[PDB]
Amino acid sequence: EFLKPRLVDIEQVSSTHAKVTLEPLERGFGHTLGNALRRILLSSMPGCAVTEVEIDGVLHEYSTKEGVQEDILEILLNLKGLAVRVQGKDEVILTLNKSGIGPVTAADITHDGDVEIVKPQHVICHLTDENASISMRIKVQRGRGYVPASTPIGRLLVDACYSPVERIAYNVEAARVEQRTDLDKLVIEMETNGTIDPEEAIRRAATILAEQLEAFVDL
Amino acid sequence: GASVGIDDMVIPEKKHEIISEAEAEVAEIQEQFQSGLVTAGERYNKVID
């Protein structure tokens, strides 16, 4: 005599924030289900992040470049927060060629159709000289979790973060006009970087929870 | 979830009137010392008490 929850509302107010609503939920199941979904969402979710940056002329990260206002370390910290989404590939190499006075954004990347930049307003660096030019090779691979670089000369390694979500907040409230009174409603408000679908994240979290609970089912 | 705050350390409501009576007693002892009835050491001891 248990009612299974369904996806009755997937609200998308912005590209980063979204709302997921689970209407049929009994008393007591909503809190533990929201807590388990929040733990799986904040624990392990697959994503794509920058791992290796190779710039022509730059030898190590503790140096500068003639014409760039920022240092190499500031360029790597700006490239660490680059939100990117790969459709069906594991590893891809991005190319960024820019010359002249002007800010260098994510829209100046000569990329193919399999990869997509979700935020072209991300400023990488600034060029202050007309004779200055940059040509970097951004290596992006798919992972899970937080893998630092501590685990060629011009090759620079950065700490990759495969965490597409940033903040998960759920809320349990009383149900609707449905005649059974003790039903509860779970509303999950997630904050991502725009590279993950919310419904696909909920399906993956429930699949991870079911594949972890299968050992308790078998016993 | 125990925590400290600025509202946990309460102030007694009768602190200001006790300070007022103490300052009035110090002023009365100083006025008695200015007339020449008590010495300086007895005045200091009464102020301390």
Binding site: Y62, Q69, D129 | -
Partner: protein, 100 residues
Amino acid sequence: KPLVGTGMERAVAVDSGVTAVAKRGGVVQYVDASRIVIKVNEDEMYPGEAGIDIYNLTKYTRSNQNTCINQMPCVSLGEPVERGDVLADGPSTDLGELAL
């Protein structure tokens, strides 16, 4: 930067020799991570052999306590600056304050 400060952080950041304080005011001509070029105005220019100011920033090097001291620029191209304003932020310095 500290959200709860005092106001003496700018005195520590200016009176110490960790920042690049502009000697003569003017307009910033060339901004770079290693050097800052300042175009001095005609009000403070010398009557003989008028020139510009070049500030070579102190990059990554070793201090006495085996730490890294580094100066990062804080000005932009074509920005008016005055005499006494900072041009580069040294170690533990954020826009002319003390950021420990």
